[PDB]
Specification:
The structure is a homodimer.
Chain A (H helix, E strand, L loop, with lengths): L2 E6 L6 H11 L5 E6 L4 E4 L5 E4 L11 E4 L5 H4 L3 H11 L4 E5 L2 H7 L7 E2 L15 E2 L4 E4 L2 E4 L4 H13 L2 H10 L18 H30 L1
Parallel strand pairs in A: 1-2, 1-5, 5-6, 6-10, 7-8
Antiparallel strand pairs in A: 3-4, 9-10
PDB class: lyase
Keywords: DJ-1/PfpI superfamily, lyase
Assembly: dimeric
């Protein structure tokens, strides 16, 4: 009866994509949160932070919510047939199929974005259309039972949105207050629309090699879905 | 590298993990930083939600830190009366460039004697406990007093870490990280502060926290008495 929420934990995950939502959702009543990988045990995030998977694919219970985080490690997952098959297995009956940041590229490689409105990190947004999505430039996008959040910190806004859907607005507001989530960022550079042009150029320059490599992975993943 | 800025987080049982992991992912995005997770011995430490984290060094083996940061959580009450942890914090604070905390981590700094006469903040529900530890309580999200920087409740760690990033490096670097994290928040509700949440929600929360507040008040006054002797 407890709501079963599962996050895919993979090598080179961007940990905040997972740990942000995890602390929001684990604050709710009658939930059980799982960290899923091919085997239980340590998984190292892109920053070197060590996390611990609690269950293998096989021991994972049927999930009410599956959530795919993003990170450097998504490129490997986009061409991992075991991971994609596991995601499809769980998406088949989950109440909600969800992701944060570049986790939506993994949903895309699995075939789960075909014809659906979705978002991702601003620097990778161009990769949604070849995976079949209708790209939407909004921070949390819902299409039926699919919810996708934009880049990294959008996971917190995503998780509060999901909390209200699983329970109600009052429950989500109580968690928001406990987390003191009334942000006051010290700069206004969180979006390419508002950041200084010099900052946007530097962020794009740093992402360029990853984007090129992911353009190539994306087109192979799309060609598999087509064939 | 061997010239890296040395950043250390205290990692303790029953920590509120987002107080640590939020700042960690922000600060680990900066050039040539080494981040340590510090406890009495290396190994697994379980956060209040059940998430398992891994301490990388003991108190004894931790190198001199440029930045020390104390997160909060249910486990702070024990830390406020842990002489080994308090001695480590005081030792590192003698030479750190920045002495910092998030949420109820500032109550640990207070128990260590590091808030006497200093402006500081903490989680909204525990803010009254700052004054008995000698602090000047300030109702802002990120409060700076010299080389002391404190953040308010839980998610304030992200705002705190971007503020610290600009001090360690510069505004341009902190803005780049903000953009990489797509940190343009759009909360679905407006209940993140007791001033804006529905009154029914604020009351429910105070109702829930009352027992913890009364227990932490007694710990706080015991810790204050040790500073006075």
């Amino acid at each position: 009866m407890a709501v079963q929420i599962g996050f895919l934990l993979f090598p080179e995950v961007q940990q905040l994509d997972l740990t942000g939502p995890h602390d929001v959702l684990a604050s709710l009543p009658d939930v059980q949160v799982h960290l899923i990988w091919k085997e239980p045990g340590p998984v190292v995030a892109s920053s070197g932070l060590v996390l611990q998977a609690t269950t293998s694919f096989a021991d994972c219970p049927p999930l009410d919510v599956i959530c795919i985080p993003g990170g450097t490690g998504v490129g490997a997952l986009m061409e991992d047939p075991q991971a994609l098959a596991f995601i499809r297995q769980q998406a088949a009956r989950a109440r909600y199929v969800t992701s944060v940041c570049t986790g939506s590229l993994v949903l895309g490689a699995a075939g789960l974005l075909q014809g659906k409105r979705a978002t991702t990190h601003w620097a990778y947004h161009e990769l949604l259309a070849p995976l079949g999505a209708i790209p939407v430039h909004e921070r949390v996008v819902r299409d039926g039972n699919l919810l996708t959040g934009a880049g990294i910190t959008a996971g917190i806004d995503f998780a509060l949105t999901l909390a209200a859907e699983l329970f109600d607005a009052a429950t989500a507001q109580r968690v928001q207050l406990q987390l003191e989530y009334a942000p006051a960022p010290p700069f206004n550079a969180g979006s390419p629309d508002t950041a200084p042009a010099s900052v946007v150029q530097q962020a794009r320059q740093r992402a360029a090699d990853s984007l090129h490599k992911r353009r190539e992975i994306t087109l192979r993943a799309a060609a598999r879905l087509a064939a």
